[PDB]
Every structure is written in C-alpha cells, then in structure tokens.
RNA sequence: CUUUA
C-alpha cells in the first residue's frame, strides 16, 4: 500500500463559505464553525459600523491555523468539488452552507523580471468563473495585448487573503490602456474562448 | 440554499 499525505493537505488561511442564510449574521457562523476551532469571517463590504450581514448570502472565513480548515472539510458533506455544513438558520429547518478553500498553486504569476508596478499600469477583472490559473491568465493577455508583467487573483497584504476577481499588470502604459480598452476582453488561445468584465484597477 | 475589491 501507499499514501499521498503531507502533499494534499496544504491550504490557505482563507476559505469561501457559500449560501450564508438570511437573518443571522457574523455571530451565528462564528458559533457554527467553532466546533473545528476558533475562526473569524470577513467580506469586501465589511465595516466598523456594526451593521453586519453581507450583501445577500455569501461570506469568506479567515483562520489562524491551517489544520482547522482540514477538520471542517474532512468532517462534512461533499459534492465532487464543494462541501456542506448545517447551521439550523431561521429561514428553514436548516441551511446547507457550502465550503470551498483557496489552494496554494496559482495565487499569483509573473512573465518578466518583476518590473516595478504602479496603479496606472494595472487592470482589474471581475465576473470570473471559479478557476483562472494565473499562469494561463497572463499568457492569454500576452497573445491579445502583450506587454504583461504580472497577473493573479486580487489579494490583501494586511489580511493575507484573496478577495475573488483578479488583476493584471503591464510593463507598458500602452498595453494597460489596451486591456481596459473594452468592457469585455478577448481570452482566445486557439480552441479556447472566454470573456470577462474589466475596469481600471483601484484600492 | 452557492463566492468579494
């Protein structure tokens, strides 16, 4: 017999949790996932106004240890790519909330000597599907616009987590204005085609 | 009851 441990248990300190139910908010989920150790939750619209409750019904957890996401993903339901947990929320008898952690392989990529970057040479990309792979994201922008230098999924250095969507940066101001030249960029690479919404990058 | 700058 053989095993693949210590090579399939790596994970990020961030995990998406889908289907967050109505009514209840940050406190009830900080009590639902607590059975796997202490946790916290955040979203891009979060504020210190103590208003709570995300825009509709999805949120993202932050963790302190990389083994806590392992117990909450190994002691729950699965569906060939996502998982479910129970929370008995006030909208129904129960809300199967989903889980989907971030993986350590394509968080970022570069295709040049990592030249200096500026907010005047970077584009944001949103409306994306779940997979993207920063390697192929940069290669495609290089076949339709060129001048690419860096690509990856949007992240924050103070909370050490992704914010979904993505960004791309160029070593030329000409390739930058060519990438935000239309709301829908071309993602063709031969026998392949994708489309996504763009805007000037901002933070 | 299925994802955000």
Whether A71 and A24 share a structural domain: yes
Q: Are A29 and A64 within one domain?
A: yes
CA A51 to chain centre: 24
Distance A56 CA to B3 C1' (A): 11
Helix, strand, coil % over all residues of chain A, rounded to 5: 15, 30, 55
In angstroms, the CA of A159 and the C1' of B3 are apart by 18
Nucleotide nearest to A154 (CA to C1'): B5
What is the Cα–Cα distance from A17 to A54, expressed in whole angstroms? 12
Find the helix or strand (DSSP H, E) in which A27 lies. Answer: helix A26-32
In terms of domains, do A112 and A196 share one? yes
Report the CATH number at residue A143: 3.30.70.330
Q: Residue A4 CA to nucleotide B4 C1', Å?
A: 33
Nearest nucleotide to A131 (CA to C1') is: B3
Collapsing DSSP to helix, strand or coil, A141 comes out as helix
Q: For residue A175, with 0-12 CB atoms within 10 Å meaning exposed, 13-18 middle and 19 or more buried, which class applies?
A: buried
Q: Which domain holds residue A186?
A: 105-203
Element (H, E) at A134: helix A134-144
Shared domain check, A81 and A119: no
Tokens read off for A88: 């008995």
Report if residue A169 sits inside a domain: yes
Same domain, A123 and A82: no
Q: Is residue A62 a part of any domain in this protein? A: yes
Q: What is the CA radius of gyration of chain A?
A: 19
């Amino acid at each position: 017999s053989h095993q693949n441990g210590e090579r399939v248990e790596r994970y990020s300190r961030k995990v998406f949790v889908g289907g967050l139910p109505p009514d209840i908010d940050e406190d009830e989920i900080t009590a639902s996932f607590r059975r796997f150790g202490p946790l916290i939750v955040d979203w891009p619209h979060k504020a210190e106004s103590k208003s709570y409750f995300p825009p509709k019904g999805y949120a993202f957890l932050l963790f302190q240890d990389e083994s806590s996401v392992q117990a909450l993903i190994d002691a729950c339901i699965e569906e060939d790519g996502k998982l479910y947990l129970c929370v008995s929320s006030p909208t129904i008898k129960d809300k199967p909330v989903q889980i989907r952690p971030w993986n350590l392989s394509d968080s970022d990529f570069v295709m040049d000597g990592s030249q200096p970057l500026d907010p005047r040479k970077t584009i944001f990309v949103g409306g994306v599907p779940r997979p993207l792979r920063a390697v192929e994201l940069a290669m495609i922008m290089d076949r339709l616009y060129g001048g690419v230098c860096y690509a990856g999924i949007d992240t924050d250095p103070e909370l050490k987590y992704p914010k979904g969507a993505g960004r791309v940066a160029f070593s030329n101001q000409q390739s930058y204005i060519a990438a935000i030249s239309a709301r829908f960029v071309q993602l063709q690479h031969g026998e392949i085609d994708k489309r996504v919404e763009v805007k000037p990058y901002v933070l």
